[PDB]
Sequence to fold (942 residues):
Amino acid sequence: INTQVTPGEVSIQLRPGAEANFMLKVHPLKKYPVDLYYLVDVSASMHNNIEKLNSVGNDLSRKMAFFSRDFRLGFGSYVDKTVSPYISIHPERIHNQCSDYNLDCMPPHGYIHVLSLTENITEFEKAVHRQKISGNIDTPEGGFDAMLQAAVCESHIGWRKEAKRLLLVMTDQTSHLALDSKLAGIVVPNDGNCHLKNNVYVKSTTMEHPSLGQLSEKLIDNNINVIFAVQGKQFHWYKDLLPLLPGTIAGEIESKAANLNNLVVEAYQKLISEVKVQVENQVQGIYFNITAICPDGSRKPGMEGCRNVTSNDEVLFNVTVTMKKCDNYAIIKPIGFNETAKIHIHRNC
Amino acid sequence: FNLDVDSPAEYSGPEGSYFGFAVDFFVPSASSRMFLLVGAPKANTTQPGIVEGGQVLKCDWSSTRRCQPIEFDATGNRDYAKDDPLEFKSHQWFGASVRSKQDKILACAPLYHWRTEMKQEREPVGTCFLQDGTKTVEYAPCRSQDIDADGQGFCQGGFSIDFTKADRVLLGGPGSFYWQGQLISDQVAEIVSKYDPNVYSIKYNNQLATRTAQAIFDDSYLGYSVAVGDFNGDGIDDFVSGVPRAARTLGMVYIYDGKNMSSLYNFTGEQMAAYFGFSVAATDINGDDYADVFIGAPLFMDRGSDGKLQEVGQVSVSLQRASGDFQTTKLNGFEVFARFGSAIAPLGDLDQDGFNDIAIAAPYGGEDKKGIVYIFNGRSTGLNAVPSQILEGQWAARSMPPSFGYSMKGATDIDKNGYPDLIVGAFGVDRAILYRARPVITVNAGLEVYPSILNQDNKTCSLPGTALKVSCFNVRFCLKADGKGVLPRKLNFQVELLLDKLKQKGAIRRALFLYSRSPSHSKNMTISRGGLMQCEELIAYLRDESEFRDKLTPITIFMEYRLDYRTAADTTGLQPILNQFTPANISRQAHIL
Ligand SMILES: *[C@@H]1O[C@H](CO)[C@@H](O[C@@H]2O[C@H](CO)[C@@H](O[C@@H]3O[C@H](CO[C@H]4O[C@H](CO)[C@@H](O)[C@H](O)[C@@H]4O)[C@@H](O)[C@H](O[C@H]4O[C@H](CO)[C@@H](O)[C@H](O)[C@@H]4O[C@H]4O[C@H](CO)[C@@H](O)[C@H](O)[C@@H]4O)[C@@H]3O)[C@H](O)[C@H]2NC(C)=O)[C@H](O)[C@H]1NC(C)=O
Ligand SMILES: *[C@@H]1O[C@H](CO)[C@@H](O[C@@H]2O[C@H](CO)[C@@H](O)[C@H](O)[C@H]2NC(C)=O)[C@H](O)[C@H]1NC(C)=O
Ligand SMILES: *[C@@H]1O[C@H](CO)[C@@H](O[C@@H]2O[C@H](CO)[C@@H](O)[C@H](O)[C@H]2NC(C)=O)[C@H](O)[C@H]1NC(C)=O
Ligand SMILES: *[C@@H]1O[C@H](CO)[C@@H](O[C@@H]2O[C@H](CO)[C@@H](O)[C@H](O)[C@H]2NC(C)=O)[C@H](O)[C@H]1NC(C)=O
Ligand SMILES: *[C@@H]1O[C@H](CO)[C@@H](O[C@@H]2O[C@H](CO)[C@@H](O)[C@H](O)[C@H]2NC(C)=O)[C@H](O)[C@H]1NC(C)=O
Ligand SMILES: *[C@@H]1O[C@H](CO)[C@@H](O)[C@H](O)[C@H]1NC(C)=O
Ligand SMILES: *[C@@H]1O[C@H](CO)[C@@H](O)[C@H](O)[C@H]1NC(C)=O
Ligand SMILES: *[C@@H]1O[C@H](CO)[C@@H](O)[C@H](O)[C@H]1NC(C)=O
Ligand SMILES: [Ca+2]
Ligand SMILES: [Ca+2]
Ligand SMILES: [Ca+2]
Ligand SMILES: [Ca+2]
Ligand SMILES: [Ca+2]
Ligand SMILES: [Mg+2]
Fold:
C-alpha cells in the first residue's frame, strides 16, 4: 500500500537480551502536490512588507509548475495576545493602537484565519490585497501560538494528506516564549488543542504560549514543513533554533524583498532533497538503534539521516531493535513525509 | 526524608481565587504565636466599586484553620478630578507576592493600572502595602513623575520581592525601560516615615536602584525573580535577580552588591529559550558558611539517548568559594513537560545534620500532572543529587491544572519540635498545604563486647548445662539511641534476638536456647537517650539430637530495631522518624582465631 516508505509494517518477536534488525527503505517520489500556507505577521513593524505580497501570486505558481503536480495557497495573520502589557488598554487605543499617529490600523488579534487553501490564485491575490496592519507595544510578537494554531486546526485551514504540507511564517522579529505570559496574569499552560471558532483564535487571551518542545511535537505530528522567512537581524535568532526544531528551514529576506519567490522555491528544493527519521517509542526496555545508509555510503547516526537525496535514488535505514527488559509498538517516520512505518513489535517475557 | 505526608495540615480559600499563589510564615516574636500567610490574587474583596482586588489571608495553625484576610487596604479608587479616577484597583492581582520578616508583612500588586497625572492613561506600575505592626503603609516606587513604556510606566513593580537581613526591601520590576527590567532596594526605616496619603511620587533618601541601559537589552525581564545572600564577604546581603531572556533568550542571572548596587558576578545559560533565571534561591547548602546560588530553567530541552530532545528542565547549583569562584553543577528533571526547576526554596536543616537543605518543585509533573516536589539534602561536598523524598499533590484538576508546587516556603518550625517545616500552594484548586518535619533518631546498633572473639583453642568459660567442650555462646544484643529535638525519653525500641537470622528457619538449628524452651527469642529493651547500650544477654548451647540437617551451621543472628512509634509520638501526633541512612541490622561473625 505504501509507496514512499517501505516497508510500511513489520511484526517482530524478541526475547530479553537479544537484538533483531531489518531494512527500511525510503524512496522519495518524483513530483509532490504542494500546499503552501502564508502565516503572515501583520504587526506594525511588518507594514512595509505586506504590500510585497501582491507579487507572490502568479510568479511563484509559475516558478513551482515543474516541482509540483498542482499548487495551493492560503493566508492568515497574527499580531499578539490582546491583553496588557502587550497592547494598550486605553479605550481609544485598545481597538486601534496606531491612533496616536492617525493610522487606519486594524484591531489587534491573536490570530485570524483568512483564506483556506485554494488553487485559485486570483482568490489569493484578492484576499491579500484587502489586508490591513495592526499594532501593539512589545518588541517581540506572538508568532509561535499562531503557528501551533495553524498546525493543529486541520479542516479549517484545509490541509491535504496527499500533499507536501508547507507553512511559511513571515516575520521580522523574535517571538514570544511560553512563560512570558506571566506578566499578563496568564499562568495556564497551553493544552495543544486548537480553538478556532469563527476563524478567530478565541483562547489567545486565557492560556499561555506554547514552548519549543510542544510546538515541535505538534508540528511533526501533523507533517508540517515550516519555512521561516525572517527579514531583519532576527534571522540569526530564528536560525540558531533550527537544531531544537527538527525539519524546519530559515531563509533571509533582504531589504528589497524581491527575493521572496526565490526564497520559497530554494527552501522547497532543499527541503525535498533531504531524508531523516525519528522514532516515537513508548515501550519499556526496548531501545532502537538506527544508522542511515546514504547513497554515498556514509554511516550517519540516522537521527539527521542522509541529505542531498533526489529521485531515482533510494535511501535505506539500517535499524537494530534491542530487548533489554520486560514489562505496544513504535512507529518510525521520516520527518516531513506523509507515510509512516508501523513496527508492530511483539514482546514475550 | 522526614517530612510527614501522613498528616498534612490542609487549607482552602474561595473557589477560583488563586488561593495559594504565594505563601509564607508569620512569626511575630512579640505575640509568640505562629501564623501562615497566603495570597489570593483573584479573590473578591469588600472594596466598593472594585471587582477581584486580591486578598492576603492570614491562616492560623494552632488547631484553628480560620483564614482572616489582612485588611491591608479597604478603600476604592482615589480620584484626580470629578469622574476622573486616579487608579484602577480592579483585577490588580494583589497578594501575588507575600514576604514576612519577624514583624512586617509586604504584599504587592503587579497589575495595578493607574491614570498617570499628566494624561489619561492606564499604566501597570504596581504597588505594595507594607504593614508594620499597627501602622500600614503603601510602597510604589515605580509610579513616578517620569513614566511611560520608555520609562518605568510598565514597571509592574512587585512582581518579585524579598527582605534583606538589614531591614531593606528588594523590589523587582520586570517591565521598565521597555522590559529591560529593574531592581529597587529601600529600607523599611524610611518607607514608614515617608508616607503622605495625599502624595503619589515619594522620594526616598536612601534608595538604591538600577538604571537604564542600551536598547539591545529590551525584553530582558530583569527582576523576574529576586533573592538575597552575602556574596562578597562584607556581611550585607547582596541582591540576586534572574533575567530569563538576556543574550538572545539564553537567560542570565545578575548579582549586585548590596551596599551600592554595583555589579559583582554574572551567570549565563547554555540553551536558547530555556528560561535560565526563572527562579533564584541563595542558600548555604554545603555548610561551609558561604552562600550558594541556585538557578532554575524550567523549559530546558535535553537530548535523549536516541537523539530526540526532551523538555525536562534543569537546576544549576553553584557553590561559592572563598576566592570569588563558583563550582557549578547541573541537575536535570525527571518527567518531560513537567517544568522541573519552577520553584526552589531553602528548607533550613530539615534533618539537623549540619548542612542546610533545599527542595525543588515540578508543578506539572507526577501522575495525572497533579504535581511533585523533590527534597534534596546537603553534604560536605555540596548538594546530594538524588532526592531523598518525593512529595506529591493529592488534588485533581477542576478546570485548570492544580499546579501543586508553584509556590512553597520553609525554614521555620511551627510545631516548635526543633525542625523546620514546609508549606506548599496548589493554587489551581485554591488550596495550600502544610507539612511537618518529624524528629530524627540515630540508632547505633552494637555488636562489640568483652570478650570480643574466641580463637576456639581455649574455653574462657564453659557454659553449664552443656555436654560439649565448647564455651558459652553469648548472643548479647543492644540498641543505643540519641536525638536532637522534642523526643520522649523512653524509646520503646522493641527488638528481637531470632536464632540464626543468617540461616533458614522452620528447622531446629544445632544451637538452641533451651532455657527459652525454643531457639526463637526476642527482646524489648527500653533504651534511654544518652545512655549506654542496654544489653540483653542470651545463652545457648549445642545439644546432641537423634537426627539433624548437620552437626553445626555458622549463621549470625540479627537484632531488630523496629519501633511502633505509638508511644514515641508527642502530643501533636508526630511520630519520630528512624534515620534510613544507618543500617537496619547489625551483628558480629563467628570465627576461629
Ligand atoms: C554582567 O552583565 C551585565 C549585562 O551584560 C553587564 O552590564 C553591562 O555593562 C556594560 C559596561 O558597563 C554596559 O555597557 C555600557 O558601558 C559603557 C562604559 O563606558 C566605557 O566603556 C565602553 C566600552 O567600549 C567605552 O566604549 C566607553 O567609551 C567607556 O570607555 C557606558 O558608558 C554605557 O552607558 C551608555 O548608556 C547610557 C544610557 O543610555 C548613556 O547615557 C551613556 O552615555 C552610554 O551611551 C553610549 O552608548 C549609546 C548607545 O546608543 C550611545 O548613543 C552614546 O553616545 C554612548 O556611546 C553602558 O553602560 C551595559 O549597558 C550593561 N548592561 C546592563 C544590562 O546593565 C555587567 O557589566 C556584567 N558584570 C560582570 C561582573 O560581568
Ligand atoms: C477565482 O477567484 C476570482 C476572484 O478572486 C473569481 O473571479 C470572480 O468571478 C466572479 C464571477 O463568478 C465575478 O463576479 C468577479 O468579479 C470575479 N473577480 C475578479 C477579481 O475577477 C474567479 O471566478 C475564480 N475562479 C473560478 C474558476 O471560479
Ligand atoms: C501520501 O502521498 C501520496 C502521494 O502524494 C499519496 O498517494 C496518492 O493516494 C491517492 C489516494 O489516497 C491516490 O489517488 C493517488 O493516485 C496517490 N498518488 C501517488 C503518486 O501514489 C498517499 O495516499 C499519501 N498517503 C497518505 C497517508 O495520505
Ligand atoms: C545493517 O546492520 C546489521 C546489524 O543490525 C549489520 O549486520 C552486521 O554486519 C557485520 C558485518 O559483517 C557483522 O560482523 C555483524 O555480525 C552483523 N550483525 C550485527 C548484529 O552486527 C549489517 O551489516 C548492516 N548493513 C549495512 C549495509 O550496513
Ligand atoms: C467576584 O465577584 C464578581 C461579581 O461581583 C464575579 O464576576 C462574575 O464574572 C463572570 C465572568 O467574568 C460573570 O459571568 C458573572 O456574571 C460575574 N458575577 C456577577 C455577580 O455579575 C467574579 O467571578 C468573582 N470572582 C471570583 C474569583 O469568584
Ligand atoms: C548502536 O550501534 C552503534 C554502532 O552501530 C553502537 O556503537 C552503539 O552502542 C549502539 N547503541 C545501542 C543502544 O544499541
Ligand atoms: C549532491 O548530489 C549531486 C548530484 O548527485 C552532486 O553533484 C553533489 O556533489 C552532491 N553534493 C555533495 C556535497 O556531495
Ligand atoms: C561598591 O562597594 C564595594 C564595596 O567594597 C566597592 O568595592 C565598589 O567599588 C563600590 N562601587 C561603587 C560604584 O562605588
Ligand atoms: Ca508583540
Ligand atoms: Ca555583600
Ligand atoms: Ca557554600
Ligand atoms: Ca540536612
Ligand atoms: Ca516541625
Ligand atoms: Mg513587529
Q: What stands out?
A: Chain B touches chain A through 47 residues (CB under 8 Å).
